[PDB]
């Protein structure tokens, strides 16, 4: 099937274009070099690595339908898929925690020396944790056959799905609704279109993260404890589309990012 090549190649190109523009914008503009924007750059790097390393072999699987490369190559492919997707999800959770620090710890957030240490620790933790989650697949824990490159371990699927998605998902959800409650509290305590804008952004980021990743993981848990395969593939491609949409929703609304993208 050569019909998948076009569509999936445009998806890869869209992801690469958006994340590269975010990285170039943050690097070039001195006003944009802040620690929250460095968390955004970490998310963009995760998405760019998804598009560059992981997705091209996923296109190969769709086109050829069978794995005609080495078995160790298949192991690298699956562990890279898990690692980069987990890194993207954990970067989203880190951005949520940073935005919470902005609202509930305004004085500590403003301090440069403490904020640098916080963000360097968060970036290190998310990347190390994604690597440690993905590493057992390198050990031949996956049981793929010679023809096909897939993950056939239900136990690893459940255990990695939990730590990689569910608890960062619950944490991000609780953190964002906490930010919403604090925003409403200060709105009651106290032009005003910015206050509705903040609500819009929280709803948009939550909705994108729910729609793109939740169906895939819930389908995995339901499967491991029948459903057709085409929607399974589409659910995986939705998770990949998360990487396409993240650099839009996390930068294109902010004005300073728009100026850099125009320039
Ligand atoms: C069809 C077979 N493939 C391709 C290698 C998968 O199932 C991939 C397995 C994933 C997976 C399992 C378990 C935990 C996880 N966290 C993050 C991901 C993940 C990414 C996720 N990708 C998108 C698909």
Swiss-Prot record:
**Membrane topology, record value:** Multi-pass membrane protein
Which UniProt keywords are listed? Cell membrane, Disulfide bond, G-protein coupled receptor, Glycoprotein, Golgi apparatus, Lipoprotein, Membrane, Palmitate, Receptor, Transducer, Transmembrane, Transmembrane helix
Gene Ontology biological-process entries? acid secretion; adenohypophysis development; adenylate cyclase-inhibiting dopamine receptor signaling pathway; adult walking behavior; arachidonate secretion; associative learning; auditory behavior; autophagy
Extract the SUPFAM superfamilies matched here: Family A G protein-coupled receptor-like
According to its UniProt record, where is this protein located?
Cell membrane; Golgi apparatus membrane
CDD domains with a match to the protein in the record: 7tmA_D2_dopamine_R
Topological domains annotated Extracellular: 61-75, 140-155, 223-233
What is the role of this chain? Dopamine receptor whose activity is mediated by G proteins which inhibit adenylyl cyclase. Positively regulates postnatal regression of retinal hyaloid vessels via suppression of VEGFR2/KDR activity, downstream of OPN5.
| Subunit structure, interactors included | Forms homo- and heterooligomers with DRD4. The interaction with DRD4 may modulate agonist-induced downstream signaling. Interacts with CADPS and CADPS2. Interacts with GPRASP1, PPP1R9B and CLIC6. Interacts with ARRB2. Interacts with HTR2A. Interacts with GNAI2 isoform sGi2, the interaction allows the creation of an intracellular pool of DRD2 that can be released to cell surface upon agonist stimulation. Interacts with DRD1. Interacts with KCNA2.
Could you tell me what this protein is called?
A: D(2) dopamine receptor
Native organism is: Homo sapiens
